[PDB]
């Protein structure tokens, strides 16, 4: 994979250095329905007029971006997204801006969030969990090799495509950094203890998050939960983990190594890096090449109606998309 990654970095760097800009405009799309929301924006199902293709259009109010102090994070998101390429990363198809909004148009992944299916089904069996986990492992290997840290892993940000494979979305907290960084960001249940403790951290926080995701997929609930974020952080920092009775010995050993408070001992962060995870007994049945090639048969295939079907997504309250005749925050988002 060393020769693959070296070429992958070469491809990535060209686009990182000279980013795509202004590859569409709003009136090229008909907005249909909201697919999901986050603290500052919504993702809408749209239909592209000239092609007839459906896409997921992420809309960011520039004023809200600024208010929540997310200018650099939003610039990060777009710059990274337009430069990456991997089978399990949602593709950015177009991006643009107008007087009021930033727009990131992605491929529409109709199978819905892993979150919905996980909560509905209750929990995934270990092979089912392993199938998804493997894709995240390879994806993080790819991202980290590019000096990228992801920082927002959770079932809400993992979409199931028509083949039952994972598409990672939401690069809102993604950042290109060599060495450590300090921003307190992510989702409380998925925060590594070094994020909470404000001491600076590196890509090993993504591996901790992988442990949290694997646990939640396999248990049906997270390893650290409570009614309030501050209560969750207390449990994370204690580091005490308890496993369901049905967890295999192999799964528990892997999780102890991922949910490891000690950075000199956390899997993924050691001398042999990602190979400590890839070669773990829990992944013994995993053909890593077959996964990458999408040749492994998926355990779950979302019911797929029409190309613009949203039946795998919850309904959200709609809201008009406003565009002022006055340009807002022009200089701030010049590079977008």
């Amino acid at each position: 994979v060393k020769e693959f990654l070296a070429k992958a970095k070469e491809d990535f760097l060209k686009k990182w250095e000279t980013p795509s800009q202004n590859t569409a405009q709003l009136d090229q799309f008909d907005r249909i329905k909201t697919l999901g929301t986050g603290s500052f924006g919504r993702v809408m199902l749209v239909k592209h007029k000239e092609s007839g293709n459906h896409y997921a259009m992420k809309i960011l109010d520039k004023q809200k971006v600024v208010k929540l102090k997310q200018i650099e994070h939003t610039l990060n998101e777009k710059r990274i997204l337009q430069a990456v390429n991997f089978p399990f990363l949602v593709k950015l198809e177009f991006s643009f801006k107008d007087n009021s909004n930033l727009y990131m148009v992605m491929e529409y992944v109709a199978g819905g969030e892993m979150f919905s299916h996980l909560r509905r089904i209750g929990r995934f069996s270990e092979p089912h969990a392993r199938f998804y986990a493997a894709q995240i492992v390879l994806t993080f290997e790819y991202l980290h090799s590019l000096d990228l840290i992801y920082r927002d892993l959770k079932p809400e940000n993992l979409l199931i495509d028509q083949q039952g494979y994972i598409q990672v979305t939401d690069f809102g907290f993604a950042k290109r950094v060599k060495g450590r960084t300090w921003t307190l960001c992510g989702t409380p249940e998925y925060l590594a203890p070094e994020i909470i403790l404000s001491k600076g951290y590196n890509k090993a926080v993504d591996w901790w998050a992988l442990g949290v995701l694997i646990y939640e997929m396999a248990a049906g609930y997270p390893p650290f939960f409570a009614d309030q974020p501050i209560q969750i952080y207390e449990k994370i920092v204690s580091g005490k983990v308890r496993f369901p009775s049905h967890f295999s010995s192999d799964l528990k050993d892997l999780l102890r190594n991922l949910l490891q408070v000690d950075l000199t001992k956390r899997f993924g962060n050691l001398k042999n890096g990602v190979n400590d995870i890839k070669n773990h007994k829990w992944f013994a049945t995993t053909d890593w090449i077959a996964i990458y090639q999408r040749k492994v048969e998926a355990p779950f295939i979302p019911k797929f109606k029409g190309p613009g079907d949203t039946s795998n997504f919850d309904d959200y309250e709609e809201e008009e998309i406003r565009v002022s005749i006055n340009e807002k925050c022009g200089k701030e988002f010049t590079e977008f």
Partner: peptide, 20 residues
């Protein structure tokens, strides 16, 4: 059970990310 305690908790829906 842990499952029951989770299901009765206030954080079983989609979880918001945090910044600052």
């Amino acid at each position: 059970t842990t499952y029951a305690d989770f299901i009765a908790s206030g954080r079983t829906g989609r979880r918001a990310s945090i910044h600052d």
